[PDB]
Amino acid sequence: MERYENLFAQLNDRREGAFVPFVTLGDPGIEQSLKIIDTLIDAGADALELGVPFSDPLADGPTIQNANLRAFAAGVTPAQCFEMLALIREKHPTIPIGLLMYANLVFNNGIDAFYARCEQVGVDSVLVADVPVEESAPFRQAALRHNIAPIFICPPNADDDLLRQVASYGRGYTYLLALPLHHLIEKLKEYHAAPALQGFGISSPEQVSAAVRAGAAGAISGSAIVKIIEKNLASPKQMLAELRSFVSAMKAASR
Amino acid sequence: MERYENLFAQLNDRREGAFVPFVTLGDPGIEQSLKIIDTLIDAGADALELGVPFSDPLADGPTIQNANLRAFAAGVTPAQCFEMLALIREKHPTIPIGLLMYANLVFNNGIDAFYARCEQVGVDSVLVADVPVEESAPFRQAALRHNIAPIFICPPNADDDLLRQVASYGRGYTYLLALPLHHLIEKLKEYHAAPALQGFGISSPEQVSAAVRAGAAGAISGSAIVKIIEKNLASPKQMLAELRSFVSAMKAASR
Amino acid sequence: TLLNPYFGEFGGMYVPQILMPALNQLEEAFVRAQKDPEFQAQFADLLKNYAGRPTALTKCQNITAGTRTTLYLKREDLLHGGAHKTNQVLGQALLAKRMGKSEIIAETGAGQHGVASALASALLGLKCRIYMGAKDVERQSPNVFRMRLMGAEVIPVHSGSATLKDACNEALRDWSGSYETAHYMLGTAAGPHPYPTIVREFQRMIGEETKAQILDKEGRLPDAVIACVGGGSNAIGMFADFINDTSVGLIGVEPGGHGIETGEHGAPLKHGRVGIYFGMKAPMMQTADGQIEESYSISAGLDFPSVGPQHAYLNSIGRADYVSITDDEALEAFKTLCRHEGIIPALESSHALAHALKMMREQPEKEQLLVVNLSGRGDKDIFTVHDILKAR
Amino acid sequence: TLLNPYFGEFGGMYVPQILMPALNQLEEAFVRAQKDPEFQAQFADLLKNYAGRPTALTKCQNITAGTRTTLYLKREDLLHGGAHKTNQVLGQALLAKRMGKSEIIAETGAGQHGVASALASALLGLKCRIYMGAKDVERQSPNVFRMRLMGAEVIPVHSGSATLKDACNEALRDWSGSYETAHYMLGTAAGPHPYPTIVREFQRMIGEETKAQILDKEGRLPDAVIACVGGGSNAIGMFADFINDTSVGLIGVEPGGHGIETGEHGAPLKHGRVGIYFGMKAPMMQTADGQIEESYSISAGLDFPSVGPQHAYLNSIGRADYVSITDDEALEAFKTLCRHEGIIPALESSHALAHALKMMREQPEKEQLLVVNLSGRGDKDIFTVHDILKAR
């Protein structure tokens, strides 16, 4: 939780936005995945949003859907994910690490036990894609008890009652996915909601800058990164090169 | 009609039974069929029962069923049958000739017209397999008007009312197909029914003699002949030889 | 006979002498049964508790859009078995039992009659042997499995042109010898008396129900009732109860196949000559010198090369009108029902529907209340319709 | 929420935030509808005039010979469509309309749900898109033709292991974006609230009719009511009305597949672990580290790797009992019904029957009045049963 507060503070003094890439743990391989994350961070990523391969991501698109298949095929398991995570943390002590999970993977061995291990490996936040605020009680409380920031998605069709709830319940940051977006950032700030990160379709520097200007604290690059991996699945050396550049670009555009 | 009366008279003075073979007109070929009939007569047949190939003989067995197929395949038609018939008569003026027909072939061009042509070609009797006594009025009357003997089958399950009807309505002969058969011949003779010919399964001399002794005026060899044709369909020269002998045998056993 | 074997000039008992006793026995039994309230009660129980009667009368919603025609469907497709054949097969089965019989004989073409007799037999505990044309066997594998599954013995007949036509012969031959213990369950309102009469009385609930349903829903009788004519049971089933309501039109539809002018059709009532076949005198498909010919239709169920004698009669006196519908017309009627009412009709029943669609389209501002007898469901037909369409 | 999303601990709304508005809208509409007598009247009209309700309750005649068991069958096989699925698909369709929707979204496996949604859509005039697992597509050609024939757009999904599981994902993804104009017609009494509740209320006529029919015919309630459990709609349909008649036993039958001990089965309620999937918390087929696994059964219709939450609940408190029946046991029950009652049941429904046959055979002198929900007809299965038997 602490790491986010730290990040957003530093970002402010330098009056810049946060650039947060998304990646699937173990895609396309474990060592390849680890090599990829080290690049993203070195290339300028402020934080990380990491996915744990799940069998039924009824909340993801084909891009992410295909990422999981690759991981699975690679032999990745939740257990292996946690090993990778301890390793990532070991080398990068300050970088905030958020996890994108599915409710079953969390519920599997008892909720509390899940967050316990998160805290243990040094994970900062967790986003359970299939748990609306309406059913978050157990997940929330467990997260807070293990000093884990429970991340919540703020959808386009978000009403006011929802806005107030997301503001109260969340920590670390707000996942921003009618409503004049400017008013969204507005309402949240007003409700003392955790800093909002713009998540919907951020795939060009133009968009990063816009988000910042719009009042967002930064932007999450949802699948643009997963694309590069795919495009270069063929050639690794270029997978990294393409990664470095893309990130460097997106980052430059946050300042 | 006259021919039958003549035959049965002569047979009596010589105290013998009539041997009547059955054959399909045009089976296996027209000339082959004609050649076959000349043999049957020469071999001793007292009379002839001739069949006209019909598409749906719901009253015949596979043996006769197959005979029709052969004829059809040979290109035989009712019309061709009548030509053959004039020819048979032309060479054999005294031999009684009976036809085995299906009601449609008779009804086709008008009933009366059918019997008219029978009389014209010199046919003595007609058996319409699918016309019970109950529906024979039109066929009967037309037959009588053209001096054609209407033959009727007397079945195993024949009751007394039927016996009286068959006796009154028929001419030429009675087609004999529980009831002590001896009593059948008895009841018929009593009703002044036309001479009864035993039709059920007469395929051995033993049977001819039996029929006679039983009181029948002779026997009709229903399909035994059609069998020989089939058996030797392969070789003609032997088809005739086998025919000659079989008939000579059956005939000898009638005396 | 206790009853009249003739309808005008059509009908009669044109069978070998050997079979008269069997027919006479059957008619006696049917007459006694008809009068037996206990019989009637048993029959009614099965129809309702086992078959699913009364069937629904559905008012079409989309198909008659933009016209002044109100189209209703008699849902015989909803009958256990998925065709109207079930009604009479149960009546016949119950009848064999009343006569103390324990064996049933049937013949089939498309297979629906085989299946229906097999099911009636299974339920009432009768031994069942079904004669089938090896040609039909080969192309009706699925129906053969159903039959066997139901404990019916399927005897493939090859004799002649292995088809219904020949099936009937062996069926009849069998019965000649076994009528003492067995009962012949003829498939339609045809053949020798009293089958045309029996099959009718055992199918007449269709019409009686339609009459009550329509009076309840519309408060008036239909202008016309339309049904397809293969051999004629579904049709007479529908018509029977309306015969005396002279204001109601009766329309029977025969398969036009490729089109009359082609000769490749199955419409003897209107395009054939009366003859003598299957123990009856009625219109049929025959050659010039009297050989019975085969019917033709996309729908195997309409393949009877002749027609029930009561139909030939109703026509003669002008009480009922007969029309033809071609393969192509049936197929479009098929597709149209699927699309607009989400009902898959038998290709047979599609011939009746196609005609009603014709009436509607030709005279769109003509106000008329029609009822089509949807004699069966088309599940059995999707493969046919499939391979037709794909081919196209 | 207006209603309780939970049955004991099972149920809830475990979906992305984006879908909550849609679910909330749906529940509001259902509640208003329930209270709308006009709604109830319209629904009742269709069920009766279009689908064929009430279905018959057949007393078996031969199958229970030599025992003291009286076996009745709820003839859902006689429903238009040939399966119970039709009842709720009509309710849902009517509901989409009340909400001013004009598009329907559905997913399918075996194909029966696709076909049923397609027919409901065709009749009420809704645009219909159906997601299908390309694996299922390949093996459900016939069902695909039916769907297309009915004007439904069939979208083949390959993502993951092209199956229902994945079908559901795209269906859900679609709805997230289109819920404004489209309605998601979920296939069983599962998924997020209020589907488990809706699907139940729209299937409860089965049970209500059974209750009235049995009291009329036997003058007493059954000892037990047996139904198969794929996802649970037919079962809860049957059970719902008898829940408060504590003297009536409720038995749900899950596919045992090759046998439990083999792992190749589809019985999560009794042999799986509760988890969170398809927007609900219920028992399911999952690996040790939480990956959802596939069900297995000879019958594709019983392939749901989880179960409705109300069932998991009824079990928990011991109101209802759940058992399993293997492939082999189902197959024999199939064959037995054909042979003795001349009824071809769905391989699904055969699982419920097989269990009732078990009860009867094990305790032949035990007097008991049973009712089996014959959820469908087996026409769709003859090829399967065929190629199984021939293989043997």
Ligand SMILES: *Cc1c(COP(=O)(O)O)cnc(C)c1O
């Ligand atoms: C058999 C059949 C027919 C044809 O028979 P009819 O004897 O003319 O009534 C028509 N429709 C269906 C659905 C059939 O199965």
Ligand SMILES: *Cc1c(COP(=O)(O)O)cnc(C)c1O
């Ligand atoms: C679909 C189907 C089932 C399984 O579904 P439930 O949701 O468990 O009721 C059972 N029987 C038939 C005939 C079906 O089509």
Ligand code: NA
């Ligand atoms: Na016909």
Ligand code: NA
């Ligand atoms: Na299940």
